[PDB]
Design an enzyme around this catalytic site. Structure first.
Site, PDB file in Angstrom:
ATOM      1  N   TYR A 133      -4.528   7.919   4.792  1.00 34.74           N
ATOM      2  CA  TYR A 133      -3.575   7.101   5.529  1.00 34.74           C
ATOM      3  C   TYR A 133      -2.526   7.973   6.211  1.00 34.74           C
ATOM      4  CZ  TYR A 133       0.238   4.053   6.734  1.00 34.74           C
ATOM      5  OH  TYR A 133       1.210   3.440   7.483  1.00 34.74           O
ATOM      6  N   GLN A 180      -1.945   8.437  10.264  1.00 34.24           N
ATOM      7  CA  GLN A 180      -0.697   8.110  10.939  1.00 34.24           C
ATOM      8  C   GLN A 180      -0.193   9.285  11.774  1.00 34.24           C
ATOM      9  OE1 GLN A 180       0.197   4.857  11.011  1.00 34.24           O
ATOM     10  NE2 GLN A 180      -1.710   4.857   9.830  1.00 34.24           N
TER      11      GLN A 180
END
Lengths: 130, 130
Positions: free
Chosen positions: B120, B124
Site C-alpha cells: 500500500y 501510494q
C-alpha cells in the site's frame, strides 16, 4: 481487553496507514517528534488508546483501539485532518496547504473465539432474565 | 479480500452479537427464517458482505465486512432497529414491546499482513511521486 458501557461490550482495533505528500523524508527530527505528540493528543481527545504508532519519514502506521461510535473513515480523517492543521501551523517551511495525500489504508484487527461469543450471550441472558 | 473506495483501501470486518428481549425461544420457525432474510437484505442495502450469520432462537451472531464509512455502533443499531421494525410488522404476536434488548457486542476482526501494508505504502508513493 474488551471494554464496556451500560449497553455495549466492544473491542475495536484498526490499523491506519497514510503517507506525506511530496517527499519521502518529510517526517523527520522535530517534525516527526511533533507529529507523534499531536497524534497522541488527538487519540486521547477521541477516547482512543494507541497500541502502536510508527512515524516514519515516508509514512504513518497508527494501530489504535477506538470506541464503536466512530466510523473508520471518521477516525482516519480526524487524525489526518487535525494533525495536518497543527503540523503545518507549527512548521512554516513545510510545503503547500496539504501535508497528507487524500488516501489512507484501514484494516480492522482481532480474533473473536466462539467461547467469547458464547460467554457474552450467557451474560446477557443472565442479566436480562429469561 | 481487501477492497477500495474513492480514496481508500480497506478491510473492515466486525462481529456483532445481540439477543431478543424476553424469551430464549423467540427466533424460531417462520420468525427465524424471516429474520435471516431481513438481515441479509439490510446488509445488501448498506453495501456490506456477510461473512457468517447465525440466527439462533436466543441470539444473533452477524459477522460482516463493511465499508469504512460506517461506525460499528451505527451498524449494530441499524441492523437491530430496521430488522425489529420489519419483524414486528410481519409477526404481530411479538407485540410485547421491543424485539431486542438495547445491548450488543461488537468486535473487529482481521490479521492484515505487513506485505499488504508495505505494498500500500509503495503504491501510494508510486502514484504521488516524489
Amino acid at each position: 481487553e474488551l471494554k464496556s458501557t451500560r449497553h455495549t461490550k466492544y473491542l475495536c482495533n484498526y490499523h491506519f496507514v497514510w503517507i506525506p505528500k511530496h517527499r519521502r523524508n518529510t517526517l523527520v527530527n522535530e517534525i516527526a517528534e511533533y507529529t507523534k505528540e499531536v497524534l497522541k493528543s488527538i487519540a486521547e481527545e477521541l477516547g482512543c488508546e494507541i497500541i502502536a504508532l510508527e512515524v516514519m519519514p515516508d509514512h504513518i502506521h497508527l494501530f489504535v483501539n477506538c470506541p464503536p461510535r466512530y466510523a473508520p473513515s471518521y477516525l482516519a480523517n480526524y487524525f489526518k485532518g487535525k494533525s495536518a492543521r497543527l503540523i503545518l501551523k507549527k512548521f512554516p517551511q513545510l510545503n503547500k496547504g496539504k501535508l497528507w495525500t487524500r488516501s489512507y489504508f484501514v484494516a480492522t484487527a482481532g480474533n473473536v473465539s466462539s467461547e467469547v461469543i458464547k460467554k457474552y450471550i450467557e451474560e446477557q441472558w443472565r442479566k436480562e432474565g429469561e
